[PDB]
Amino acid sequence: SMFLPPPECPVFEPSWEEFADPFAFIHKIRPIAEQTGICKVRPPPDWQPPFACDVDKLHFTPRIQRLNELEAQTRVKRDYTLRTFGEMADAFKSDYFNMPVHMVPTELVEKEFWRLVSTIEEDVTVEYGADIASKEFGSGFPVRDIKLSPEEEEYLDSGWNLNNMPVMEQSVLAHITADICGMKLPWLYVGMCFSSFCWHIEDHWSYSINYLHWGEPKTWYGVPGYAAEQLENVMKKLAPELFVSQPDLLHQLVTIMNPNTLMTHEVPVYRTNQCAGEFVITFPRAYHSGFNQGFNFAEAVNFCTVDWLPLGRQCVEHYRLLHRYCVFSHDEMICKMASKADVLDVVVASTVQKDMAIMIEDEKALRETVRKLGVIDSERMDFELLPDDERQCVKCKTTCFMSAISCSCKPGLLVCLHHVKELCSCPPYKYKLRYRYTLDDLYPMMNALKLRAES
Ligand SMILES: [Mn+2]
Ligand SMILES: [Mn+2]
Ligand SMILES: [Mn+2]
Ligand SMILES: [Zn+2]
Ligand SMILES: [Zn+2]
């Protein structure tokens, strides 16, 4: 009829044994879940992290949201307490349906959501909270600081405590010394009925994991990584405005779009209702979107496993082709890890070694190419010391680290080695190759990884 629900995504109910190590578990389910893009994880029944907060002392600045299909919204960006938001949220839903909120069936809210976003005559606006953990509003999980109860202490070091998972043994994102707070810290989300997250994939094609601490469910739609470009082609045809070049990371355009539209164009889509106490995990380059069924409170964080490393490299290549800004330098991350080879997990070391080999071979070829273009002069340069906005390629916006080209003619400007012709009109003999490492510096770094991997 008017909305046909996508098939359900995989749901996993790990034993305590399986659940004990999140990264082991995620690797285990990956062959299944990567075919659906998202999956849901129900922790063991007795894994129950305690949640406690004063609803009157937690306050936040609400974002306002129009609910129109295909309309452009910006991705990342009054004052409520948690109590006053809750009161607004419950009344909104109660008044919308002329029902008590627990009586409103989830399938009805879903059907109605897709009706109202598609109808021009309706102009429903809703509000929500989205912000990284701060002193005004912290994690929903226990954090060390305030005398904690024994039950809180039990969950302090859990891999599934989303504060840990970042610095947790296997997110290569942990090792990044660069400032990436917006991407590495957990985000807190206060939802209300119909408040929604537009179709998107994570920066650098990372994983994400979302925990619903309490409240009414969050409805999700997800698309497997292998269908990412199919989805973008559908979107581009129906809403080209979203695909124009953007001046920076703070201007990414995203939109609401009916999953049935994707399914009509043979893009595979899965759904789920995430309830309180459940996790949803999104996989690399898996498009996802959704909306809240009512007043709720969620927490989510990005992470990167060793499975992800090659995709991370591919993603930055993709950003270059699109002239998209990077959140961090992938090569910088790889070299930081190489410089710490002795303390790396051995499987991590082994996987980093493989990416590094590709990095070095690509870098070798690029340097040979720019030499043949007539760039002769060179000087070592510690790229990691420059603010990001001072080491982006003029042309493709990539964050430089391995090397770049400069010219005294254009002080402070840089191009990556793919865009030597785009820096200025001076002949290439006026240029300098700025490089972080010689090829001779690099091979021993990679050898340290091999030794650590015992290889
Ligand atoms: Mn509408
Ligand atoms: Mn997301
Ligand atoms: Mn180009
Ligand atoms: Zn470039
Ligand atoms: Zn010049």
- Here the CATH number for the domain that contains residue 191 is 2.60.120.650
Structural domain including 365 reads 327-455
| Angle, in degrees to the nearest 10, between helices 439-452 and 346-372 | 160
**Does one domain contain both 35 and 109?**
yes
Q: For helices 309-322 and 346-372, give the axis angle rounded to 10 degrees.
A: 30
Contact between residue 229 and residue 290 where contact means Cβ atoms under 8 Å apart = no
Please indicate, yes or no, whether residues 365 and 276 belong to a single structural domain of this protein: no
- Compute, in angstroms, the gap from residue 201 CA to the centroid of ligand 1: 24
Residue ranges at the known binding site = 128, 200, 202, 208, 210, 218, 288
Residue 366: phi and psi, rounded to 5, are -70, -40
SS (H, E, C) the chain: CCCCCCCECCEECCCHHHHCCHHHHHHHHHHHHCCCCEEEECCCCCCCCCCCCCCCCCEECCEEEECCCCCCEECCCCCEEHHHHHHHHHHHHHHHHCCCCCCCCHHHHHHHHHHHHHCCCCCCEEEEEEEECECCECCCCCCCCCCCCHHHHHCCCCCCCCCHHHHCCCCHHHCCCCCCHHHHCCEEEEECCCCEEEEECCHHHCEEEEEEEEECCEEEEECCHHHHHHHHHHHHHHCHHHHCCCCCHHHCEECCCCHHHHHHCCCCCEEEEECCCCEEEECCCCCEEEEECCCEEEEEEEECCHHHHHHHHHHHHHHHHHCCCCCCCHHHHHHHHHCCHHHCCHHHHHHHHHHHHHHHHHHHHHHHHHHHCCCCEEEECCHHHCCHHHCECCCCCCECCCEEEEECCCCCCCECHHHHHHCCCCCHHHEEEEECCCHHHHHHHHHHHHHHCCC
Determine the Cα angle at 129 with ends 55 and 131, to 5°.
100
Q: From the CA of 152, how far away is ligand 1's center (Å)? A: 44
**202 and 309 co-located in one domain:** yes
Integer Cα distance of 165 and 159 in angstroms: 5
Ligand 2 centre and the CA of 199: distance in Å? 8
Where a domain ends, among 306, 326, 346? Answer: 326
Q: Which residues pair with 209 in a beta bridge?
A: 281, 301
Q: Which tokens belong to 64?
A: 């306002």
Ligand 2: centre distance to CA 366 (Å): 34
Query: Residue 433 C-alpha to ligand 5 middle, in angstroms?
Result: 13
What separation in Å is there between the alpha carbon of 243 and the centre of ligand 5? 32
Domain end marker among 271, 292, 326:
326
For residues 320 and 343, state if they share a domain. Answer: no
Structure token pair of residue 384: 């990691």
Does residue 334 share a domain with residue 320? Answer: no
> Can you tell me the distance from the alpha carbon of 129 to that of 88, in angstroms, rounded to the nearest whole number?
13
- Asked if 357 and 288 sit in the same domain, the reply is no
CB 129 within 8 A of CB 85: yes
Pairwise CA distance, residues 313 & 330, whole Å? 7
Question: What count of Cα atoms within 13 Å lies in the side-chain half-sphere of residue 71?
Answer: 12
70 and 164 inside one domain: yes
Looking at the structure, do residues 268 and 298 belong to the same domain, yes or no?
yes
Question: Which residue has tokens 């759904």?
Answer: 271
Max Cα-Cα span within the chain: 75
For the chain, the domain total comes to 2
Domain boundary, last residue among 326, 345, 372: 326
CA 291 – CA 192 distance, rounded (Å): 9
Distance 335 CA to ligand 3 centre (A): 26
What pairing do the DSSP bridges indicate for beta strands 11-12 and 38-41? parallel
CA nearest neighbour of 218 among 294, 303, 328: 294
Residue 40 and residue 127 in one domain: yes
Helix/strand/coil (H, E, C) string of 167-201?
HCCCCHHHCCCCCCHHHHCCEEEEECCCCEEEEEC
- Planar angle of CA 234, 397, 429, nearest 5 degrees: 135
CA 391, 394, 396, 397: dihedral to nearest 10 degrees?
A: 40
Q: Nearest bound ligand to CA 419?
A: 4
Same domain, 161 and 96: yes
| Cα-to-chain-centroid distance, residue 31 | 20
Ligand nearest to the CA of 183: 2
Alpha carbons 396 and 255: distance in angstroms, whole number? 25
User: 297 and 235, same structural domain?
Assistant: yes
Q: Which residues contact 322 (CB under 8 A, 6 or more apart)?
A: none
Q: Do 173 and 295 share a domain, yes or no?
A: yes
Start-to-end C-alpha separation, the chain = 59
Ligand nearest to the CA of 410: 5
Residue partners of 316: CB distance under 8 A and separation at least 6: 204, 326, 330, 398
Resolution of the determined structure in angstroms stands at: 2.0
The answer to whether the Cα torsion of 113, 117, 118, 124 is positive or negative is positive
CA of 396 to the centre of ligand 3 (A): 7
What does the alpha-carbon distance between residue 439 and residue 443 come to, in Å, rounded to a whole number?
7
Pairing verdict, β 296-303 and 253-254: unpaired
